[PDB]
Amino acid sequence: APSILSTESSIIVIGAGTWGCSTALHLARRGYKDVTVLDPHPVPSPIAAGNDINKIMEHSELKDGSSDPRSAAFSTFTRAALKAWKTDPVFQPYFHETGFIISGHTPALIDHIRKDEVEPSETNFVKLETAEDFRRTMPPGVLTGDFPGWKGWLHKSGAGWIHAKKAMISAFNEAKRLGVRFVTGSPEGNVVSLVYEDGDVVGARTADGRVHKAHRTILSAGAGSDSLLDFKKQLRPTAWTLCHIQMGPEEVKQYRNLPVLFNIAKGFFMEPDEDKHELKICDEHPGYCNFLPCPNRPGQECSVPFAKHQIPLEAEARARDFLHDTMPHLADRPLSFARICWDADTPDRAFLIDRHPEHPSLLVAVGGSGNGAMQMPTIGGFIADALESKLQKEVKDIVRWRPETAVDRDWRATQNRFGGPDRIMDFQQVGEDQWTKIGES
Ligand SMILES: Cc1cc2nc3c(=O)[nH]c(=O)nc-3n(C[C@H](O)[C@H](O)[C@H](O)COP(=O)(O)OP(=O)(O)OC[C@H]3O[C@@H](n4cnc5c(N)ncnc54)[C@H](O)[C@@H]3O)c2cc1C
């Protein structure tokens, strides 16, 4: 029998990343007086995927939606997220409604975007057919490439980019100010395992040995969640790569209020951040896994997350071939920063927010699956809903606990992503001299 939930209930959130801070904030705002958040790092965490100078936000509605319940759930998440990016003062300053370009460069990719993304959407786009159509979405001198074989779609409003790092900091700040307790650092906040009494989770044991007891334990640790609970293959830690190119104080002025340019098989980039003038590029691919035997001594293989402020040279290559099609004049610029970035993919890349059906006091909130950052303002809300057993019908069944969809899971399934070798890649098959070497020299 799980304890009756009230505002006095001591709550623990494991993980103060994108989803953790969002939850801490929402719990605070609802009247919960006893919320403690645990993280092995101070905000922003160096391993939190939400720690990026920028991420893409997009919201689309559907024609129908009875035709695709997975996607109808996503609109529900994003309709909420967009509204909050525009009205909630904690999040508002860090949304940049600059627009979103989705595109490809081969017949089958372009037809894919037409069929899966554009046709089903109630959104009205501007069809980009030529190299001038791409170049003229941005000020003179920003896009200067030939865009070979490229065809795309511009989405003006209800899409843009977000300063995820700062918004995560802003939410942390407001949660902390409304009275949430943040235990962020090692060993105090580094949770090494959960705590069981009578088949349920009574709290969290951290690396310092203390058992933090709670009536409800919320687990939101991103890629790290896999090594804290048996998720039954429902979470694939996968990594993606990014790198920063620093701009000059003179040239950087032209790269302002730029719409997100995404080619689903080459990558995307976002406008230079206001602080360091750094321009960010991700080479799009199905992702990097780090295949090792699981930490629990099996012959089962797993993707184990590690941290690195470098990227494989093969990713720098893919980034620069992207640069070359779009902004050739920046193609041979030296990188100023790079790192690998860890998320968790579910078998269908819908979120995982549910009470564990064997430990009712545990609430997992994980599996952002590449689309979790934009949800920042409001994800904590649906998480609070789930906790408060009122997760609305439009999403409940889609994001529920579902280990049967991960039976016989192919860890190398491309999960609707394209680019590079068009296969899942493995960090183990990348040499130690085959990474970038940023600084110095
Ligand atoms: C390269 C890249 C680009 C992306 N671009 C976008 C985008 O444009 N738009 C979008 O919506 N999404 C995007 N995503 C997904 C995005 O990163 C989301 O932020 C991700 O889904 C975040 O979910 P999260 O809060 O659960 O994880 P995180 O933000 O990573 O938070 C995890 C936190 O849990 C902590 N933690 C870890 N381990 C332990 C432990 N043992 N005990 C306690 N605590 C712990 C971590 O330190 C961290 O603070 C992108 C992802 C990547 C990798």
Residue numbers in the entry: 2 to 442
What does the paper say about this structure?
In this study, we apply a novel rational design approach to the stabilization of wild-type Amadoriase I from Aspergillus fumigatus. Using a rational in silico computational design and screening method, we have produced two forms of the deglycating enzyme Amadoriase I featuring a significantly higher thermostability compared to the WT enzyme. In particular, the introduction of disulfide bonds provide considerable stability to proteins by locking their fold in a well-defined local or global conformation. We used X-ray crystallography to confirm the introduction of the designed disulfide bonds in the mutant enzymes.
To confirm the formation of the designed disulfide bond in the SS03 and in the SS17 mutants and to assess any possible change that such modifications may have caused to their global molecular architecture relative to the wild-type enzyme, we solved the crystal structures of these two thermostabilized species. The crystal structures of the SS03 and the SS17 mutants were determined at 2.15 and 2.85 Å resolution, respectively. Focusing on the region where the mutations were introduced, the SS03 mutant (S67C/P121C) is highly superimposable to the wild type enzyme (residues 62 to 72 and 116 to 126, RMSD = 0.842) while the SS17 variant (D295C/K303C) shows a structural rearrangement in the region from residue 290 to 308, with an RMSD of 1.657 Å. Interestingly, while the introduction of the disulfide bond in the SS03 mutant does not cause any significant structural rearrangement in any portion of the enzyme, the formation of the disulfide bond in the SS17 mutant affects the conformation of one of the loops that define the boundaries of the tunnel leading to the catalytic pocket (residues 63 to 69) (orange circle). The RMSD between the SS17 mutant and the wild type enzyme for this short region is 2.745 Å. For the SS03 and the SS17 species, the mutations did not significantly affect the apparent steady state parameters relative to the WT. The SS17 variant, which shows an increase of ~8 °C in the T50 value and, contrary to all other tested mutants, a gradual decrease in residual activity at increasing temperatures, features detectable activity even after thermal treatment at 95 °C.
